[PDB]
Amino acid sequence: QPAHLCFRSFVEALKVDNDLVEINTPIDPNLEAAAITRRVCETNDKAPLFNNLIGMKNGLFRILGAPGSLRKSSADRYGRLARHLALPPTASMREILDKMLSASDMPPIPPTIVPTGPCKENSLDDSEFDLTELPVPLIHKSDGGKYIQTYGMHIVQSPDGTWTNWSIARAMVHDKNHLTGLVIPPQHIWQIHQMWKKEGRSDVPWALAFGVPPAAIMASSMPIPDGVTEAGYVGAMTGSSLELVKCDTNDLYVPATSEIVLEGTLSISETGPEGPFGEMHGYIFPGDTHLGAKYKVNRITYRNNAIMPMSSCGRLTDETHTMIGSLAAAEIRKLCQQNDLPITDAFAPFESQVTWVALRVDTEKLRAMKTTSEGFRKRVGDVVFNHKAGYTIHRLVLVGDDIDVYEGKDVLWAFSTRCRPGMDETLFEDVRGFPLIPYMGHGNGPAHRGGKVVSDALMPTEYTTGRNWEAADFNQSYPEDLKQKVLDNWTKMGFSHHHH
Amino acid sequence: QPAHLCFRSFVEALKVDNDLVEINTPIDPNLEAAAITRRVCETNDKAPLFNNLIGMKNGLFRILGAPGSLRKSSADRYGRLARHLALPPTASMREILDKMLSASDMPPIPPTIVPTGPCKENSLDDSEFDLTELPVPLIHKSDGGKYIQTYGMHIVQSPDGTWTNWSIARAMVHDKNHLTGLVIPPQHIWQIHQMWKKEGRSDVPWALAFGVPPAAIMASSMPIPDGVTEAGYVGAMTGSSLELVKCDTNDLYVPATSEIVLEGTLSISETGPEGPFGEMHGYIFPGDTHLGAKYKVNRITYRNNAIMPMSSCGRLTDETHTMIGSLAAAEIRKLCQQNDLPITDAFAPFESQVTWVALRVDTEKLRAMKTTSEGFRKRVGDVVFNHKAGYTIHRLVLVGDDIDVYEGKDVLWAFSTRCRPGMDETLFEDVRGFPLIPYMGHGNGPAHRGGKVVSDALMPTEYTTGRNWEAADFNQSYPEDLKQKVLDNWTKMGFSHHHH
Numbered sequence A, B: 001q002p003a004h005l006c007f008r009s010f011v012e013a014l015k016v017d018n019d020l021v022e023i024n025t026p027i028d029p030n031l032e033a034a035a036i037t038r039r040v041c042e043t044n045d046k047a048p049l050f051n052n053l054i055g056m057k058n059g060l061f062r063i064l065g066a067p068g069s070l071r072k073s074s075a076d077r078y079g080r081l082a083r084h085l086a087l088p089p090t091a092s093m094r095e096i097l098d099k100m101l102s103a104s105d106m107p108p109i110p111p112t113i114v115p116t117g118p119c120k121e122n123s124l125d126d127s128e129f130d131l132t133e134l135p136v137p138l139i140h141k142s143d144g145g146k147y148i149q150t151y152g153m154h155i156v157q158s159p160d161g162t163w164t165n166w167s168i169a170r171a172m173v174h175d176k177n178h179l180t181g182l183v184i185p186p187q188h189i190w191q192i193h194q195m196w197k198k199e200g201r202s203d204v205p206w207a208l209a210f211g212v213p214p215a216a217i218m219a220s221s222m223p224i225p226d227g228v229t230e231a232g233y234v235g236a237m238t239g240s241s242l243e244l245v246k247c248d249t250n251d252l253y254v255p256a257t258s259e260i261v262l263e264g265t266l267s268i269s270e271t272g273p274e275g276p277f278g279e280m281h282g283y284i285f286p287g288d289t290h291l292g293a294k295y296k297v298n299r300i301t302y303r304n305n306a307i308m309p310m311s312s313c314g315r316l317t318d319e320t321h322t323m324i325g326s327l328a329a330a331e332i333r334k335l336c337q338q339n340d341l342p343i344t345d346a347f348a349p350f351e352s353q354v355t356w357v358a359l360r361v362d363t364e365k366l367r368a369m370k371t372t373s374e375g376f377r378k379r380v381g382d383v384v385f386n387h388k389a390g391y392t393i394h395r396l397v398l399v400g401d402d403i404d405v406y407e408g409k410d411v412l413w414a415f416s417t418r419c420r421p422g423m424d425e426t427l428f429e430d431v432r433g434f435p436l437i438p439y440m441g442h443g444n445g446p447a448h449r450g451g452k453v454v455s456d457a458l459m460p461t462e463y464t465t466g467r468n469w470e471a472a473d474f475n476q477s478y479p480e481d482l483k484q485k486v487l488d489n490w491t492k493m494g495f496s497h498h499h500h
């Protein structure tokens, strides 16, 4: 099976790419596996595959860390992402995000039901598993539980059967047959949960699939529109119908090659302690436990020699940056264009801990709008900050065509030099805020409201007559012939490769 | 003579350090020398010494570019700065800035007058030089003139003789015997100029010395207090009285080993076209010429085989970042401490184009103040933004003790995660603004007023009971024994030197 359509094949692909370290000696899921993974993510090293995990029994489970993290080389920096999508390993961020957006104006390709698949190779009923006996990792030393769920896909369906959502949301083990996790507005798992709670008749049928098709985990991490079934979006993006099998204990459908599948229910009534967790913004607040959603597990099915993917998230750079930030930015780019705003590109700079998105403006189009900064900033912020795609983003930075928004250094330069604090910004206090940012949930103001800003780093003549500067840099402050002469004579004179 | 006390010795020191490229083939001062220098600064390469400059006659002049720019290696990143100060080449920024501040609570060591020195080896009178015939560089393709003065020291004295100021301010050639340059408030050359204009009797006696003692050019670039003669500050810092010679045509005193000395007057009445220039924030606005101060040159003296230092300034990283930003930050650190504010460290992040300063707070002291963010932000901004040392800085970022302000990535992390936009900031519109920032002089608001902000990245409990998080990073989210085990087994497992 292709790497983008089968997690097991994806692991092989990383091995082929010389982007895997297999560790075949015993590794402790109590902090050690996550510590190694953390170090990998902070140094852009090879992904670790822990084949000998202390506590693994009857095939449950190996761990793959850092499945969507960065490579060291500039040339194939995003190669692990590209391998989720059948793209060349040298693909640019622009190419990855365009691939992820491509299905937005295609007919869905609904999934194909097949009678069985590798995820049915082994099974454990209600009398045969205990989630406290599995080698679930403790990811950070102060976490409030063992976070089994950092890179699986929750599957829930609207009561009327018309929308089946796939998404990543964290969950930890509560007891032998329950998890607790984050289910918060405006996320689709929360929207669907609310539908079932209003109906009031039963708990939400649920499955959680780990080690799903890489293309599916990418869409699981992207805020595609309300009501859109991820399976058919992935089908369109990949050009192939995804093969799904029915769950044994409910009528949901899981990817045929899922490594591990939990089947059960998401309660419409019960909660349990959840967190704290070492989160995407780089912090844990020890002791900060709150009530989260509660899931009951009725059945486990799994592949022979099942592999659990794991995100050891926190400070730069991991899946919470490369996927959450980048995929939100992609959706925001499209949202702006569909609202007739002249945005060509969007990216969440890693330097901002993916709390900013830089929006590259087609300033020829802007000039034809005959508008002003105050009006344009307000328009952009109203579109983005009143939409789910803008949920995680607290600062939008508007930049002109000379800035490559995929280059943090250039975004920081433009922000620092072209946006006058205060005067060139509009604050938004009556929008939904993202409470997981420390300055929100642990800050001086309401955890759930406000704290957002549009920072205009367009210069005044970009609205009127056109850019009126040249950069004081090698590229723009010297003529072409001279630049080439300097380059051609560089090593000859005594001064200092692409792939590396 | 020691490298920190003699520019010629400093050049040798860079050669010894394997931090010099000597170019002995012809190089054009029309853009080529500056283009090579620009490339050096954007890639942290070795400093270039242009020994064969097209247009050099009768010993005027060679050029040294990038005299205060960065080295490639992390271990000796600031080695060129350290060589200005007799510090080891591996000195930290903290050590360099502490050296620059050390004289602030020492008795000055006034300069020693000596009858002659190398700067008197050659001379050209009023009939023998023409500044348009010298190989003055065109530094950026759109500059409004040939900027002879990018790394020399202006010398002016108060009318009452009690204060002699040394400072760097740019100047370009106007005609055969005049320069024009920037003389703007609140700079000391402007303050002294104003004194002479109020007296109304004569033009300001002036000298401009190029290739001065490296320790002297560092102080020339630092906002030491009003009324303080730089020569005696440098004397105290170095522990040695600087040797000065009298000018031939006036009674000012120049460093004995100056490479090149111009003697003349700064007009109290005349102006001439000045700029535009490729400036520290990374831009040139072509055609943006304004009237600047006008200097008349009466005499030139110079060393045999004189060397002109040159800053090819603009985008990161050059002397306008490493010296202007860092030395302002140093002075701001001291200013805050003298105003009883609990600041331990200050640095201007390069990522901010040195428009921000990050202030590291001793939060034990902060807690004993029993204050709030709004009160503390206001206090800090009133001290810094109403003082000359704060002139160039538009954003102050307050951070707690866990942040190393000398590490841009950590400053950006703290800013992005701990400071709620709006609520955690105080804007200052009734303070002097720095017009050279594009969003000031070429922006939407008054060029000379406002546009400043204090951004509080202290978390709420840092004011009360203490830090209440741990970082979700390798260092803080894993116990020491485990971290060491991971490190000790890192290469054994298959994963990836200080000097590099």
Ligand SMILES: Cc1cc2c3c(c1C)C(C)(C)CC=[N+]3c1c([nH]c(=O)[nH]c1=O)N2C[C@H](O)[C@H](O)[C@H](O)COP(=O)(O)O
Pocket (backbone or CB within 6 Å): A149, A150, A151, A165, A166, A167, A168, A169, A170, A171, A182, A184, A186, A187, A188, A189, A220, A221, A222, A223, A224, A280, A311, A313, A319, A320, A323, A324
């Ligand atoms: C990549 C990724 C995405 C996580 C995530 C993580 C990763 C690695 C973890 C598991 C390591 C840390 C926490 N996660 C959460 C999460 N969204 C959320 O609502 N709760 C979460 O707990 N997300 C973001 C979520 O997947 C996106 O917001 C999707 O757009 C949600 O899908 P939806 O649009 O269908 O609701």
Ligand SMILES: Cc1cc2c3c(c1C)C(C)(C)CC=[N+]3c1c([nH]c(=O)[nH]c1=O)N2C[C@H](O)[C@H](O)[C@H](O)COP(=O)(O)O
Pocket (backbone or CB within 6 Å): B149, B150, B151, B165, B166, B167, B168, B169, B170, B171, B182, B184, B186, B187, B188, B189, B220, B221, B222, B223, B224, B280, B311, B313, B319, B320, B323, B324
């Ligand atoms: C290192 C450095 C500092 C420049 C400088 C440059 C460099 C390389 C140039 C020459 C390349 C670009 C422009 N420069 C100017 C300048 N200050 C100023 O008032 N006008 C300027 O034109 N400065 C900053 C100035 O030296 C500091 O603000 C000092 O504190 C001024 O000394 P003072 O406190 O005695 O007034």
Ligand SMILES: O=C(O)C#Cc1ccccc1
Pocket (backbone or CB within 6 Å): A170, A277, A278, A279, A280, A281, A313, A320, A324, A392, A436
């Ligand atoms: O645990 C985290 O780091 C998290 C999260 C999250 C929640 C909602 C949307 C995006 C990320």
Ligand SMILES: O=C(O)C#Cc1ccccc1
Pocket (backbone or CB within 6 Å): B170, B277, B278, B279, B280, B281, B313, B320, B324, B392, B436
């Ligand atoms: O020409 C420049 O880049 C400049 C400047 C300057 C002026 C005043 C204070 C600091 C720097």
Ligand SMILES: [K+]
Pocket (backbone or CB within 6 Å): A166, A167, A168, A219, A220, A221, A222, A223, A224, A230
């Ligand atoms: K999704």
Ligand SMILES: [K+]
Pocket (backbone or CB within 6 Å): A373, A418, A419, A420, A424, A456, A457, A458, A459, A460, B439
């Ligand atoms: K602006």
Ligand SMILES: [K+]
Pocket (backbone or CB within 6 Å): B166, B167, B168, B219, B220, B221, B222, B223, B224, B230
């Ligand atoms: K000075």
Ligand SMILES: [K+]
Pocket (backbone or CB within 6 Å): A439, B373, B418, B419, B420, B424, B456, B457, B458, B459, B460
């Ligand atoms: K704060």
Ligand SMILES: [Mn+2]
Pocket (backbone or CB within 6 Å): A165, A166, A167, A188, A223, A224, A225, A228, A230
């Ligand atoms: Mn969805």
Ligand SMILES: [Mn+2]
Pocket (backbone or CB within 6 Å): B165, B166, B167, B188, B223, B224, B225, B228, B230
């Ligand atoms: Mn001074």
